[PDB]
Amino acid sequence: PDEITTAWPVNVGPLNPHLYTPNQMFAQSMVYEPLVKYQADGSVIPWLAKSWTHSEDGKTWTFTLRDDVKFSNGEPFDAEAAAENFRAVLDNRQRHAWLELANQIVDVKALSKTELQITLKSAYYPFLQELALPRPFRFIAPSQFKNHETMNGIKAPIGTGPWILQESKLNQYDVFVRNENYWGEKPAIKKITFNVIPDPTTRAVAFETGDIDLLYGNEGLLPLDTFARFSQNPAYHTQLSQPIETVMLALNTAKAPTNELAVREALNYAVNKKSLIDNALYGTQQVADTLFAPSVPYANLGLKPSQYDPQKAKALLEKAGWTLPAGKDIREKNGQPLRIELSFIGTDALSKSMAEIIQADMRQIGADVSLIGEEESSIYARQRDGRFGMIFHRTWGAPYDPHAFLSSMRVPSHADFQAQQGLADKPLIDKEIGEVLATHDETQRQALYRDILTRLHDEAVYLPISYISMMVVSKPELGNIPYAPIATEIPFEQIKPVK
Numbered sequence: 064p065d066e067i068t069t070a071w072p073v074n075v076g077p078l079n080p081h082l083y084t085p086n087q088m089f090a091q092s093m094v095y096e097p098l099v100k101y102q103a104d105g106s107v108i109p110w111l112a113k114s115w116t117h118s119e120d121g122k123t124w125t126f127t128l129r130d131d132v133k134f135s136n137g138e139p140f141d142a143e144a145a146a147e148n149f150r151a152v153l154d155n156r157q158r159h160a161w162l163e164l165a166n167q168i169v170d171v172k173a174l175s176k177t178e179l180q181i182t183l184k185s186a187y188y189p190f191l192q193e194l195a196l197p198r199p200f201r202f203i204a205p206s207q208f209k210n211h212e213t214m215n216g217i218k219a220p221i222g223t224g225p226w227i228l229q230e231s232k233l234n235q236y237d238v239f240v241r242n243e244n245y246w247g248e249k250p251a252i253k254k255i256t257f258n259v260i261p262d263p264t265t266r267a268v269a270f271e272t273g274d275i276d277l278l279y280g281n282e283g284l285l286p287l288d289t290f291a292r293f294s295q296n297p298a299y300h301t302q303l304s305q306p307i308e309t310v311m312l313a314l315n316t317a318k319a320p321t322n323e324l325a326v327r328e329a330l331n332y333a334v335n336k337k338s339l340i341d342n343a344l345y346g347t348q349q350v351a352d353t354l355f356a357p358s359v360p361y362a363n364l365g366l367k368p369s370q371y372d373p374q375k376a377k378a379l380l381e382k383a384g385w386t387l388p389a390g391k392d393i394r395e396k397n398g399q400p401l402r403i404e405l406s407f408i409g410t411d412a413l414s415k416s417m418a419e420i421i422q423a424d425m426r427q428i429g430a431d432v433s434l435i436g437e438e439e440s441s442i443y444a445r446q447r448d449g450r451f452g453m454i455f456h457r458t459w460g461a462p463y464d465p466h467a468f469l470s471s472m473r474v475p476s477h478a479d480f481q482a483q484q485g486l487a488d489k490p491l492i493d494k495e496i497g498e499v500l501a502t503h504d505e506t507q508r509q510a511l512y513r514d515i516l517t518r519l520h521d522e523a524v525y526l527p528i529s530y531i532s533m534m535v536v537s538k539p540e541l542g543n544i545p546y547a548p549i550a551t552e553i554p555f556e557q558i559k560p561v562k
């Protein structure tokens with residue numbers, strides 16, 4: 064085949080390269096390209112920029128751009144187009160706060176058609192890695208700006224990438240076709256249709272009926288019982304990647320009773336994670352003992368796991384004054400029950416399943432977990448504002464983990480800051496996060512990452528649950544389906560049915 068049909072829970076969005084919801088990162092990465100491209104080994108390679116140099120102080124960077132690249136509408140890609148894109152992004156600077164590069168860029172100038180100069184306020188180390196991300200530093204034809212901006216919308220979603228949006232129908236589908244005037248390698252696939260299918264069971268059904276050819280996504284892609292069955296079905300092809308990121312609970316250090324270190328530590332001994340994974344996730348994921356897997360850059364630190372040990376969990380609670388009243392299973396301290404609210408998306412069957420398991424495990428150690436299932440909007444508002452006891456949370460995968468995930472812990476309107484807000488050493492943690500991003504002493508960088516991650520582990524801010532994987536279900540005719548280096552991209556241009 065050379066046309067494929069796949070599915071996504073939502074439309075790809077209007078494909079503004081510089082904005083977030085409702086734009087889907089993997090679709091922005093199909094159409095728009097970066098100056099430099101992220102590789103699985105952590106390095107970046109030349110992409111729209113063929114080479115670059117930086118000053119001694121590491122604050123000014125000069126990129127030599129390819130001179131052969133056109134936007135899909137035939138307009139040239141050049142340093143002036145790149146500079147206008149940076150201006151457009153930075154004109155919306157406060158929206159990009161989570162990403163420190165957006166706070167670092169002082170100036171971007173086209174010195175010629177091929178020479179682009181970027182100036183930073185400090186020697187920001189993850190500079191190239193952050194240019195490599197799906198958004199916001201990718202390039203739309205400046206003719207498609209609205210009043211010379213993108214923050215208020217764009218006209219046509221015109222990029223330089225291997226795919227061109229053909230058409231979109233809200234709540235129905237999106238169709239992409241191969242860019243026949245692409246500067247790089249031509250994809251084998253000519254057309255990709257995304258059917259919008261919000262429900263994981265309905266996605267599985269669409270595959271079983273032959274309505275779609277490919278499903279690609281994280282642990283939520285389809286029911287995991289069904290995935291296991293599909294993996295044994297000789298008519299189908301399935302894949303499970305190596306783990307890409309962590310799923311955890313975040314505990315609110317500023318809200319009783321999770322404001323108590325002893326409570327947070329006890330919760331971290333109460334969960335048999337292997338059992339949770341075998342029960343709710345059909346044995347398809349890996350147990351997580353730490354916020355970052357030991358395979359994550361800077362995170363191989365010999366941190367001590369809190370292995371499942373309910374006797375220890377009870378002892379920790381007892382020592383902190385949380386004891387069991389006569390005839391009750393829920394602990395009390397100073398008259399107050401040990402009660403914790405777990406908020407999650409109520410219509411997410413998998414979240415609900417894990418929440419039930421967590422509630423059951425915590426009851427065994429005398430903690431009453433109240434399950435609060437709400438719509439997505441409500442849950443995001445709770446995370447932003449710290450209106451939670453516990454929430455499900457995930458890290459962001461490569462290349463965000465650890466530097467960008469850490470960077471964002473400093474932003475008050477995000478779950479991580481909110482979960483951490485009650486820690487006495489939060490200011491120090493935030494100071495050290497600032498310092499790691501700017502340091503060029505590798506020894507100091509490692510020490511800072513060690514200290515930040517060690518404090519977060521030792522303070523039991525998180526309850527890591529699983530390192531989750533990408534999964535794929537496909538018609539055999541499509542062949543082996545590759546994974547992209549960036550956890551949030553889907554490498555459709557690497558699919559090659561005919562070898």
Ligand SMILES: O=C(O)CN(CCN(CC(=O)O)CC(=O)O)CC(=O)O
Nearest residue numbers: 083084161198199459463471477551
């Ligand atoms: O989605 C956003 O608005 C920004 N992301 C930041 C990290 N994202 C990257 C992105 O959205 O560009 C990681 C991810 O969505 O996987 C979450 C946040 O600000 O807390």
Ligand SMILES: [Cl-]
Nearest residue numbers: 082083084158
């Ligand atoms: Cl937004």
Ligand SMILES: [Cl-]
Nearest residue numbers: 083084085086
């Ligand atoms: Cl979204």
Ligand SMILES: [Cl-]
Nearest residue numbers: 290291294303
């Ligand atoms: Cl499997």
Ligand SMILES: [Cl-]
Nearest residue numbers: 390391392393
């Ligand atoms: Cl009770």
Ligand SMILES: [Fe+3]
Nearest residue numbers: 083084088459
């Ligand atoms: Fe995001």
